[PDB]
């Protein structure tokens, strides 16, 4: 009819916005966790270098 | 002669009446055509909404 189509369009705009936000948040999580794990690896290498210096 | 006049008058009235009835049935047939167009359009719009929603 008439109002039904507009209501469906609203329900679809919500769909697109929610899905896009979810995808963007997932990408953010991937990037942040990669950052953290690379920092942890750098910390490990520093520990090993400290061990060599102690030797 | 009198009977002929009477019969001719009744036949003329009958012709006029059938003309009126044929015009009336034409009008009502046209109205039914319009309503059939209405149902065709509303079913088409419902199908369009259905295909849009199923196809996003």
From Swiss-Prot, chain A:
List of residues that carry Phosphoserine: 45
Induction comment from the UniProt entry of this chain: Induced in stimulated quiescent cells.
Stretches the record annotates as Disordered: 1-38
Basic and acidic residues composition bias: residue spans: 12-38
Localisation per UniProt entry: Cytoplasm, Cytoskeleton
Top-rank taxon, per record: Eukaryota
Modified residues (N-acetylmethionine): 1
Transmembrane segments: none
Signal peptide (from-to): none
Similarity comment text for this entry: Belongs to the tropomyosin family.
Record remark on domains: The molecule is in a coiled coil structure that is formed by 2 polypeptide chains. The sequence exhibits a prominent seven-residues periodicity.
Record's subunit section: Homodimer. Heterodimer of an alpha (TPM1, TPM3 or TPM4) and a beta (TPM2) chain. Interacts with HRG (via the HRR domain); the interaction contributes to the antiangiogenic properties of the histidine/proline-rich region (HRR) of HRG. Interacts (via N-terminus) with LMOD2 (via N-terminus) and TMOD1 (via N-terminus).
UniProt miscellaneous comment: The sequences of cardiac and skeletal muscles are identical.
Biological role: Binds to actin filaments in muscle and non-muscle cells. Plays a central role, in association with the troponin complex, in the calcium dependent regulation of vertebrate striated muscle contraction. Smooth muscle contraction is regulated by interaction with caldesmon. In non-muscle cells is implicated in stabilizing cytoskeleton actin filaments.
Protein name: Tropomyosin alpha-1 chain
Protein source organism: Mus musculus (Mouse)
Residue numbers of the full-length protein present here: 1 to 55 of 284
